[PDB]
Structure formats: structure tokens, C-alpha cells
Design a protein around this nucleic acid. Structure first.
Lengths: 32, 117, 139, 185, 97, 45, 163, 176
RNA sequence: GCUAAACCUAGCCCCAAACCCCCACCUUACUACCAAACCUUAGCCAAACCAUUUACAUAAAGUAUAGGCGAUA
């Protein structure tokens, strides 16, 4: 029983595409 | 009080019982003095064939070859009907092949549907 | 036809025609004896005296003299185990008096278990002389 | 319903030249000798009747036929049966051989046996407990002509044999009874 | 009568299943993983209490202000009613005050 | 002995609680909408 | 009632197959399947798995007894090789003869799949139920029957306001 | 005359009649149109005979001789409609494009539901009818709330069934 | 000894994830066919009455601030 691969931070910058209406407002301005 | 039961001609006071017919169709109108006038043009006069010499019968023989369902898709009908005609005539306007730009003229319109069944 | 929308009529139109009829007619032995000229039909509830007269005259070639129709109320007091009223359909019964003095009467239609029979006839039922003993033992 | 049996008997031999039946029967199995039938017949008879004392319900199902199980079991139900075979004088033997299509054989036995059947309260009602009485019997075995077991189909009573044993119980037989108007005339 | 007469079928518990043979693997992803992660962000479940504990009132306030704009109407009315009641109770009822 | 409070009449049925009395004012459409929410089978007489 | 999910593709047994049982009553005996009931997975086998039942049972009357064939589950019973004489698992292996056919696992053997009348007074002859009397027509049924039977009509259909 | 309402007398009370094969949709598609009409009325005569026979048998309490015949012809009858209707469809498009013969539109009933209003035939134009314009075809705002509720209700139902579905499967995989 | 006891899937609760769904029917609904929608939320409940007043991610912080400077906000 090889345990599941260990959790990690997603390896790279998070660029949420601006189309979907769910992308929270704070994750779209210049501060982020 | 009988809320659930279907509401039909047999329930209300005399006015209701008179008014609400059933699925039976009308054939004419009500002229003054409660007289009825029936029109020969609203009676669905049947058409029937002459069954003389008819070789087809209600049941097909079990021995007949088994088949497969291929519904008459529009392009299939157009092919079978026109494709030889267009092929032959194109070597020398569309009303000459069967098209009908409008339908108001002929008695058996397709859309809206006028002929019954 | 039934369950179809009909072309409407305006003064001078063409004659309404049904080239492939939908109606289905059955006929029944009357419950109380009828005149010898009367035939009793059940016809669908979306049908009229004129329709039935033309229907018979056109399809069957039976000359009709008069038609009178009556709509029977099916009973709605017969409750399922849930206590739900269950209503069997209303129907329409048409009395059709034929013409030319003809006569009519509904004719009288309708004018693995061998083992059980054979084993019952040879069952060798209790012989009361035996008084209850198993007979079979030849000993 | 694939009955293991043969309804009735095609030709039940009358109690006091059949090689075509042998050819039509032994072919369907191709391994059998009629002279191997006497020993098997006596063995199946004695073991089945012993099982009748046992009341091993499944074993009786396997040994006897459908037309033979229930009639025996119902009577034997709720009453002990102390059957017992003892030394025999006459070897049994085939009487004949008979051929959808299931075959029949018959066997003649002359045995020495004992019965003792007791009421459900333990009281004797038939037979004597230990008297070894001689018996003569005609028994038909049916053969399901795949893996047809050679079961005991039935026993047949001959009309020229002495009647049954007496019964230790007293019995009435009400015959002509009265009616509310019809007199005993 | 408050007792049964037949023993239930004996449940088979596989003590060496998958989800029992790993209960706690990566439950120390921080102290020996360079502190990249936190065990908070290993626990699946509701979005409003991934790593948070409070009493019923605080829990329902969090449910409201964090997912109370995607939740069906009748549920939302029940929730607002629940906040009103738990406010009244926690703030005006009890032995200690 | 009492209990004669209700002498039935269909005119009053269909002209006090009918489908074309609920749909005559908005509150009636509130009633019919409530009743087809709750899943009833008698939405209005 | 638990019946494991086995689809038609995953299922192998059919009505009329040579079937030998693995467990239960009458172990290791061969027979035929009169019916396969996929909805509840009943496998009736001739004379095998039989249980004897009383028919005609009243409070006193006993009637007869018959060996009703108790149906069998598909895992309890496998097919029979007509040559090797061994129940082998039916692993669906594609073959040139047939893409879907029962192929044995122990040996490369393909097991086949088990599965009259006369015209009456009111039945059509076959050669008259296939005549290609249809010529491709753009006219509907109504126009064609009216032209064929000579029905006449010239009054025009007046305009109507659909809505 | 009326004798066509009962089959040939030799079949009376027979308890079994050789029934042929119900027509098949393709087997009719192979046929012409006039023959199609004639065969339709033939089947009408048969269906009348069989329905009368069923009613009489039910009246006597004697068993229906061979009921399957009725079912067969009904299927044939249904098939026949399809065939001619197919040609109807295969003409509508090929001369008007419309996918439905009876004209209609999409509207919002007074309760907000999206409903397909099939049109009725009238002989005065719609704008001065008095019973048509009493029939609301718009949604006032107070309806909107209930729409939400309805949707939510449906969502719940969906969820439950979907949820329950997998549980069954899960329990099955815990047996094998 | 009767009456009774006794059971275990039908299904359901909370989450995640995913955006969701032929004919007749506003006239007396389920009946083929004729001259008008927008306007604060209310007061129970706390203040031991009641009259101003009184809730609809994390930390800053129950801090600035309001308040019969009070309950509370």
C-alpha cells in the first residue's frame, strides 16, 4: 500500500482566468 | 365538495349541464331563438377506397424476409425523387422540378396544416 | 378523427375530409332486449350521430335509418387499498336503427393436468376396512 | 416438468421373447446386464424399506419415485414403523423387460419379513412385532431412458394372492344412512 | 418488549483496509516538510469549517457570512431563525451571569 | 341537530373559489402558487 | 435481494446452454437451461437442484409431490466444454470468427451460443408484401388519393389567423 | 353488411386462431400510398372485429380466444401512421423547412413556467379579440420568488436520487 | 394456550463536486371556431414598565465611534 503522493503547494503562480464569474474580486486587481 | 373528481357535464345546475359538451366536435352554429343550423362543410365526410382486387391483407406471412428500420430522412426522399431529374436536366429556377415557393394556393397546405390527419 | 385539431371553416370553404379515419367502433349485445331493427354500438366519446351514420354507410355499406346516442357514466365508487377513488371510463353507446325493414340480432359467439385426473381416479382412497394402516406394504 | 417416472404401466405383466426391448433400451446406456438386476433389486428394496424405518426424508426421495414417495410417507408420518427383512429362501429374478420414452422392468420376489407399526402414542395397530412371515411380491422398476436412477416405481398386487393381515382395531362401516324424509325402505 | 431474540449478523470489520491503514499519514506535513503546508489544509469537508472550531452560534454565523448567499431559500430562513434564537438564549438565558 | 351551515351550490363554487377567481387578483396567484409548490392535486376547485 | 451488476456484455449464460454446477445440491452434474431470467438471475436446470414440493395440500388432503427445479445462480453454475469435459471460465476474448463469443480460458476453444408456419386464410403471400409499387412522389397522401380516385374539389381554402 | 364485424363463422369459439405477423414499419415504407390507404382501412375492419369480439367475450366471462391478434394489429396500425407521417415530415421540410406542422411559440404563463403554446385557429386577428387578451402571457415580479423555490425543490430531489444511487452501488461492491 | 413478541432494507440527513430543468387548458381551468407592474419592511422580543433605542476566511477589535452615554449597537 504505497501511500498517496504527499500534498504540495501548487508549483507555480496562480493566474485565475478573468472570464469565470467566480474568480474572487480580490484575486484580480494589481495587489495580488 | 368532490374536489378531486373530474369535472364533466353531469354535475352542475341546469346551465352547466347544457353548456359543457364533451370532446364531440361542433358542426354548426346557433341562430336566434335557440335554433341550430348545421353546415355540410363541417361534417367530416369520409373518403373510402374500392377494396376490389386488393392483394394486401391484415397480416403478413411469417416467412417474409426480416428487415431493418431506416426512417425516411428528408435527404433520402429528395435524393430518390429529384437527383436523377436534376442530374439529367442540369446539362441544359426550381419550380420545374417540384418546388413550391409558397403554399397559400394549393388546397393541401403543409404548414400550417389544413388537411386533417 | 379524434385527438386532432380540425381545419376551421369559413363561408365557401372546401369540404372537410378525413382520408384516414381514427375512430374505432365496437358493438354489443343489448342488456335489455331491443327492437329487431336496432343494433347497439359503443363508439368513442369524441363522436357524433352524423359521424357514426356516415361511418357505417361509408366503410361497411349498411344503410342506416336513425341514430340516437347516450353517454354512460362509469362508476367512481370502487376504492383501491390506498383509498383512492378509481373511475373506469365513461363511454358512448349508439343505437342504430337500420333502414329498408332489415333485421339483426347479435349472434351467439362461443356456441399437465391429465396427471391429476389419472392419479385421482387411481388415488386408492382410504379403504375403511384398513382402519388407517399404510396399505401398500405387501408384507 | 420432467417427471422421472412413467405414467401408468404400458404392459403390466399378468401374474401367472423380448430382445427387441433389450436392444431399444440397453443402447441408451450401453452398460448393463439383466443378471445384474436381481442383486441390485433386492439391495434397493431392503435399503429403501430400512430407510422407511429411519425416516431419512432425503434418502427416500433419492431412492423411490414421485408416484411412490408421498403415499408411503403420509401414512408413515406421525407413526413409527419397525420394518425388518430376515433371511430369504428364494432369489428374486426378472419377470420381463419393457421399453417421452422411459422403460420399465419387473421383478418377482419371495421374501421373509416383519412389520410393526405403532400409533403416535406408541400402541400397536398392525402386524406382529417379530413373527417372520413369508411374502410374495411383484415390483415394477422404472428407468428414465441421461443419468436415470433405476428406482422402484411401484408394487402391484396380484388378485390370486391371499388377502391382507388382520387389524388389531375395531372398526365400523356406516353404509345406508337415514334421510330427513327418505325412509330405510 | 425492549429486547431482541436473534443475534444480528456478525459485522466484518477489515481493520487493515486502505482508509484504516493510513489514518494519519501526512498528519505531520509541517514539522517535517519544511512547513510548506499545514495540517489545516489536509482535512476535507465544509468550506466554512476547514480548520475552525466554535460553538453552534458562531458556527451558524460563519455558515451565513461565508456560504449564506448560495444556500437555498428555506434553509437560509431556517438559519436566520436559528441565529435569532441562539442569540436570545446565549445572551439572556442560563445560570451564570 | 345543528349543522345546516352549508347548502352547496356549484355557481358559488366556481364564482368564489375557481381557477378564474384566483387568477383575477395577484393574491389569488399567490394562493395557486403556494398550492402547486406544496404539490397538491386540487390547485383550485 | 442482492444480484451483482453483470451486464449483457459481461454475462455469458443463455437459455439452452450445457451447464454444470459447482456447488449446492446435485454437485458436478450436467444439464440444460430452459430459461434464463436476467432480472433476478434464475437458472432452471432439468432435474438438477430440484426440491420436492407437495401439490394439492389441504389441512388433510396431501395430494402429490413433484420435484420443482429450484433455479441456480450464475456463479454456482458454469458452462460445459463439448470436448474437454471441464467447466472453464468464460473470459470474453475477441476472435476472428466472432468478436463476441464464449471462448474458454484453459484452452483456445470457442463455445457456440444456443438460441414452421404456413399461410392462413387471412395472411399475405411473401412475394406480394415486397412489391416496389412506390414511385418517389412529392405529393402528400391527400393529393395522391384525391387524384387517383377522382374526388373533385375546387373551392379554395380561405386564410385563417393562427395564434 | 354488418357481418364484417365478426370474422368468418368457422372461427367461432375455436379457442385458437393462427395469427400472422404484424406489419413492420420498413415493410410498409416499401409500399405505395394508395395501397397504404387501402391497407389502413382493411386493418380498421379487422380492429373493429377484434374489439367487438373482446367486448363480447368479456361479457360472457368465457376467455378471449386469442387476444394477441388485437395487439398485433394495433402495433401495425401505429406503424402505419408513422410511415405516412414520416413522408409528411419528409415533405414539410423539403418545401417549408418547418419542423412542426402545427404552428406554436414559447411563452411565459402567469406562473412563470416556460410553456410551449401551440396555436389555435381563429378568424379575427388577435389584437381585437376579447377572450385572448384576458389570458395573461407575462410574469409579474412576485412570481419570481416562487420560481426559485420550485427550482430548489427540484434540485433537492435530484440530489437525493443521485446520492442514493451510489450508495446502492457501494453496498454492492462491499459484497463482492 | 391466545393476543402478542422479534427482525432490515425501503429510503432518508449532512457535505463535497457540478450551475439547473398526439389533443386540451385564464369562459365555470383542462372547453376546436369573434370588437393593467413599480411606494421605507412591521411590531413581537431586551431595556426586568415604556414613550428615543434594540443583531439579519483570518487579524486589526469588540478598538475608534454611537447610545433615556443604557440595555445594547
Amino acid at each position: 500500500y504505497r501511500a498517496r503522493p504527499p500534498p504540495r503547494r501548487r508549483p507555480g503562480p496562480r493566474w485565475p482566468d478573468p472570464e469565470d464569474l467566480l474568480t474572487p474580486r480580490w484575486q484580480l486587481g494589481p495587489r495580488y | 365538495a368532490d374536489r378531486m373528481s373530474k369535472w364533466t357535464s353531469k354535475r352542475g345546475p341546469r346551465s352547466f349541464r347544457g353548456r359543457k359538451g364533451r370532446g364531440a366536435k361542433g358542426i354548426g352554429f346557433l341562430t336566434s331563438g335557440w335554433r341550430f343550423v348545421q353546415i355540410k362543410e363541417m361534417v367530416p365526410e369520409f373518403v373510402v377506397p374500392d377494396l376490389t382486387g386488393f392483394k394486401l391483407k391484415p397480416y403478413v406471412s411469417y416467412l417474409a424476409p426480416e428487415s431493418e428500420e431506416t426512417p425516411l430522412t428528408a435527404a433520402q426522399l429528395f435524393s430518390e425523387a429529384v437527383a436523377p431529374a436534376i442530374e439529367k436536366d442540369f446539362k441544359d429556377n426550381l419550380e420545374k422540378y417540384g418546388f413550391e415557393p409558397t403554399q397559400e394556393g394549393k388546397l393541401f397546405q403543409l404548414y400550417p396544416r389544413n388537411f386533417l390527419r | 378523427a379524434r385527438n386532432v385539431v380540425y381545419p376551421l371553416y369559413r363561408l365557401g370553404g372546401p369540404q372537410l375530409r378525413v382520408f384516414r379515419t381514427n375512430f374505432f367502433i365496437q358493438l354489443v349485445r343489448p342488456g335489455v332486449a331491443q327492437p329487431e331493427d336496432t343494433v347497439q354500438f359503443r363508439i368513442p366519446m369524441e363522436m357524433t350521430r352524423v359521424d357514426l351514420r356516415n361511418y357505417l354507410e361509408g366503410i361497411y355499406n349498411v344503410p342506416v335509418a336513425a341514430v340516437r346516442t347516450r353517454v354512460q357514466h362509469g362508476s367512481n365508487k370502487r376504492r383501491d387499498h390506498r383509498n383512492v377513488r378509481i373511475k373506469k371510463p365513461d363511454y358512448k353507446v349508439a343505437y342504430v336503427q337500420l333502414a329498408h325493414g332489415q333485421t339483426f340480432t347479435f349472434p351467439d359467439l362461443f356456441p399437465l393436468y391429465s396427471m391429476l385426473e389419472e392419479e385421482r381416479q387411481q388415488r386408492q382412497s382410504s379403504d375403511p376396512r384398513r382402519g388407517g394402516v399404510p396399505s401398500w406394504f405387501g408384507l | 416438468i420432467h417427471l422421472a417416472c412413467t405414467a401408468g404401466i404400458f404392459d403390466a405383466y399378468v401374474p401367472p421373447a423380448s430382445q427387441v426391448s433389450i436392444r431399444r433400451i440397453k443402447d441408451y446406456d450401453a452398460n448393463f446386464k439383466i443378471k445384474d438386476f436381481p442383486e441390485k433389486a433386492k439391495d434397493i428394496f431392503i435399503e429403501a424399506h430400512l430407510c422407511l424405518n429411519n425416516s431419512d426424508h432425503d434418502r427416500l426421495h433419492t431412492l423411490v419415485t414421485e408416484h411412490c414417495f408421498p403415499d408411503m410417507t403420509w401414512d408413515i408420518k406421525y407413526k413409527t414403523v419397525r420394518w425388518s427383512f430376515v433371511e430369504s429362501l428364494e432369489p428374486s429374478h426378472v419377470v420381463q423387460v419393457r421399453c417421452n420414452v422411459y422403460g420399465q422392468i419387473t421383478v418377482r420376489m419371495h421374501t421373509r419379513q416383519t412389520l410393526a407399526i405403532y400409533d403416535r402414542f406408541g400402541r400397536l395397530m398392525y402386524g406382529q412385532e417379530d413373527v417372520p412371515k413369508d411374502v410374495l411380491e411383484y415390483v415394477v422398476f422404472e428407468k428414465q431412458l441421461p443419468y436415470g436412477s433405476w428406482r422402484m416405481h411401484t408394487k402391484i398386487v396380484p388378485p390370486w394372492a391371499p388377502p391382507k393381515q388382520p387389524i388389531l382395531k375395531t372398526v365400523m362401516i356406516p353404509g345406508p344412512q337415514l334421510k330427513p324424509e327418505e325412509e330405510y325402505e | 418488549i425492549g429486547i431482541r431474540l436473534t443475534l444480528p449478523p456478525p459485522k466484518v470489520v477489515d481493520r487493515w483496509n486502505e482508509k484504516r491503514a493510513m489514518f494519519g499519514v501526512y498528519d505531520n506535513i509541517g514539522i517535517l516538510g519544511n512547513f510548506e503546508k499545514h495540517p489545516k489544509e489536509l482535512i476535507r469537508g465544509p468550506i466554512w469549517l476547514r480548520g475552525w472550531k466554535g460553538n453552534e452560534l458562531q458556527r451558524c454565523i460563519r455558515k451565513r457570512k461565508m456560504v449564506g448567499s448560495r444556500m437555498f431559500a428555506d434553509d437560509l430562513h431556517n438559519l436566520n431563525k436559528r441565529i435569532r434564537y441562539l442569540y436570545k438564549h446565549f445572551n439572556r438565558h442560563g445560570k451564570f451571569r | 341537530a345543528r349543522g345546516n351551515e352549508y347548502q352547496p351550490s356549484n355557481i358559488k363554487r366556481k364564482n368564489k373559489h375557481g381557477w378564474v377567481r384566483r387568477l383575477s387578483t395577484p393574491a389569488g396567484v399567490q394562493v395557486i402558487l403556494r398550492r402547486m409548490l406544496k404539490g397538491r392535486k386540487s390547485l383550485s376547485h | 435481494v442482492v444480484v451483482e451488476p453483470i451486464s449483457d456484455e459481461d454475462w455469458y449464460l443463455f437459455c439452452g446452454d450445457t451447464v454444470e454446477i459447482l456447488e449446492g445440491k446435485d454437485a458436478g452434474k450436467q444439464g440444460k437451461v430452459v430459461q434464463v431470467i436476467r432480472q433476478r438471475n434464475w437458472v432452471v436446470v432439468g432435474g438438477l437442484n430440484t426440491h420436492y414440493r407437495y401439490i394439492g395440500k389441504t389441512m388433510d388432503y396431501r395430494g402429490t409431490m413433484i420435484p420443482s427445479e429450484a433455479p441456480l445462480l450464475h456463479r454456482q453454475v458454469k458452462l460445459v466444454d463439448p470436448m474437454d469435459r471441464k467447466p472453464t471460465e468464460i473470459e470474453w476474448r475477441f476472435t476472428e470468427a466472432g468478436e463476441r463469443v464464449r471462448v474458454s480460458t484453459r484452452s483456445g476453444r470457442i463455445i457456440p451460443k444456443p438460441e414452421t408456419w404456413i399461410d392462413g386464410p387471412k395472411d399475405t403471400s411473401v412475394e406480394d408484401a415486397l412489391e416496389r409499387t412506390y414511385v418517389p412522389c412529392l405529393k402528400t397522401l391527400q393529393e395522391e388519393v384525391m387524384e387517383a380516385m377522382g374526388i373533385k374539389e375546387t373551392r379554395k381554402y380561405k386564410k385563417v389567423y393562427w395564434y | 353488411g354488418l357481418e364484417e364485424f365478426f370474422d368468418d363463422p368457422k372461427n367461432w369459439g375455436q379457442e385458437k386462431v393462427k395469427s400472422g405477423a404484424a406489419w413492420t414499419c420498413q415493410q410498409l415504407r416499401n409500399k405505395s400510398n394508395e395501397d397504404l390507404h387501402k391497407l389502413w382501412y382493411v386493418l380498421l375492419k379487422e380492429r373493429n372485429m377484434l374489439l367487438t369480439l373482446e367486448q363480447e367475450a368479456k361479457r360472457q366471462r368465457l376467455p378471449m380466444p386469442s387476444p394477441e391478434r388485437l395487439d398485433k394489429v394495433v402495433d401495425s396500425m401505429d406503424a402505419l401512421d408513422k410511415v405516412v407521417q414520416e413522408r409528411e415530415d419528409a415533405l414539410r421540410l423539403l418545401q417549408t423547412g418547418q419542423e412542426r406542422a402545427r404552428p406554436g411559440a414559447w411563452r411565459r404563463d402567469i406562473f412563470g413556467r416556460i410553456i410551449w403554446h401551440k396555436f389555435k385557429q381563429w378568424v379575427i386577428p388577435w389584437h381585437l379579440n376579447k377572450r385572448y387578451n384576458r389570458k395573461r402571457f407575462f410574469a409579474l415580479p412576485y412570481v419570481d420568488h416562487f420560481l426559485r423555490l420550485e427550482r430548489e425543490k427540484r434540485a433537492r430531489i435530484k440530489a437525493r436520487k443521485e446520492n442514493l444511487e451510489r450508495k446502492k452501488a457501494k453496498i454492492l461492491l462491499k459484497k463482492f
